[PDB]
């Protein structure tokens, strides 16, 4: 059925319609597919789904010059811990991407990689089994109690990495990317943000080193900066975007309590803009909103409201993605876009709605989503969410 309690309205009219290039590719729109883990890849080897993943991003390509960011997709064996969530390391894994790809590439639209790597978010007990470690920044403090526990049952402890292990990772996220682009990719998104491995960096709560990885803003930065400048070097700043989420709690980050935090994520987009004057400016910077401090959450609820990602806006001066709770806003968004360089992603409604972007052009009901199925092992919630005209021949509009 639809939102019941939604009042479309149409921003057709908005620079939400306006073309804008980002890298290498020339949307013909800023509604943006932000990434969204479905848990459809198979299990052994994190394969993506062979029955229904080609269909499913078809289906979210349909509109032409839409740019679509994957699901988070592991670098490594070692850089995983689910079972049902893809990677991009391996030959198997990569036939499957190159069909995807080619299938959004036919609607004419773009689809970059986002490349993803757990740290203590990952499940300890698959790590194990496969005989890999439960990494993180620290080995003092923990994502939750469960997970401590789940880590020393499995005798599978928590582990805070070394210089060579911090290294081993950078030389896998430059592979996964070369993978990715070799596959057909337009580009890679290097996930910094929702409480992952380089977000577990960036944070002090979970980064208690005294390294050079810890200690300071500069240090806690160092990670997430280093996969920026060895992916650059690999791949062409143009095919590479970095996501981050200053006020996210989600995966135990700190978020707004930390005072220091703007600090912390002003220095990583300073960094950017440095990097940018230098003639190395990234294809985009990925923002989650703290319209949405845990994804989780059902829209409304988790917005912190004492904290604005404005200021990465005076810092850097490429384009900027912005997501969280924008489809049941679009009065919001219309006043976003007013700002040239912007973008807006949309999650949970583009899971629900394939013709997303025809929706929003047109002030269109939304069909509501199934978080049942978010995850489930199903082409039901995944593949079979209707178009707005097949929602009428359902009669969804009496329903
Ligand atoms: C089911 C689901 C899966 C998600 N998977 C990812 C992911 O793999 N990588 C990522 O960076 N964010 C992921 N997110 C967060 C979304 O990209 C987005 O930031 C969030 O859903 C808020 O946007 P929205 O209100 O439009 O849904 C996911 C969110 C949901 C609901
Ligand atoms: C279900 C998942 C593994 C996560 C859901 C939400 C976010 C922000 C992810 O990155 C994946
Ligand atoms: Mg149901």
Do not use: C
């Not at 479905?38 to 499913?56: Q, S, T």
């Not at 010059?65 to 991009?88: C, H, K, L, R």
């Not at 620290?138 to 499995?154: T, Y």
């Not at 005294?210 to 990670?223: K, L, P, V």
């Amino acid at each position: 059925s639809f939102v019941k309690d939604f009042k479309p309205q149409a921003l057709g009219d908005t620079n939400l319609f306006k073309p804008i290039k980002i890298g290498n590719n020339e949307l013909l729109h800023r509604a943006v597919i932000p990434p969204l883990t479905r848990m459809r890849a198979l299990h052994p080897g994190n394969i993506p789904n062979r029955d229904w993943a080609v269909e499913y991003y078809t289906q979210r390509a349909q509109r032409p010059g839409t740019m679509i960011i994957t699901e988070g997709a592991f670098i490594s064996p070692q850089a995983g811990g689910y079972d049902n969530a893809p990677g991009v390391w391996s030959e198997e894994q990569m036939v499957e991407w190159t069909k995807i790809f080619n299938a959004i590439h036919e609607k004419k639209s773009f689809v970059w990689v986002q490349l993803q790597v757990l740290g203590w978010a990952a499940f300890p007990d698959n790590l194990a089994r496969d005989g890999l470690r439960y990494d993180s920044a620290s080995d003092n403090v923990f994502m939750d109690a469960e997970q401590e526990a789940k880590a020393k049952k499995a005798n599978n402890p928590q582990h805070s990495l070394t210089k060579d292990e911090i290294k081993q990772y950078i030389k896998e996220y430059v592979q996964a990317a070369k993978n990715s682009i070799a596959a057909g990719a337009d580009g890679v998104e290097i996930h910094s943000a929702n409480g992952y491995l380089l977000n577990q960096f960036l944070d002090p709560h979970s980064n208690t080193r005294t390294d050079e990885y810890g200690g300071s803003i500069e240090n806690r930065a160092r990670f997430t900066l280093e996969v920026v400048d060895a992916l650059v070097e690999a791949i062409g700043h143009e095919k590479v975007g970095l996501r981050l989420s200053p006020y996210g709690v989600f995966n135990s980050m700190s978020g707004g309590a930390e005072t220091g935090i703007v600090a912390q994520y002003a220095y990583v987009a300073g960094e950017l803009e440095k990097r940018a004057k230098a003639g190395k400016r990234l294809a985009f910077v990925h923002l989650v909103e703290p319209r949405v401090t845990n994804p989780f959450l059902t829209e409304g609820e988790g917005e912190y409201e004492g904290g604005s990602n404005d200021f990465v806006y005076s810092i850097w001066k490429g384009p900027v993605i912005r997501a969280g709770n924008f489809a049941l806003h679009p009065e919001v968004v219309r006043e976003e876009v007013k700002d040239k360089r912007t973008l807006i992603g949309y999650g949970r409604f583009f899971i629900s709605n394939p013709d997303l972007v025809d929706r929003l052009e047109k002030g269109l009901p939304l069909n509501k989503y199934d978080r049942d199925t978010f995850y489930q092992m199903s082409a039901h919630g995944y593949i079979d969410y209707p178009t707005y005209e097949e929602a009428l021949k359902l009669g969804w509009d009496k329903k």
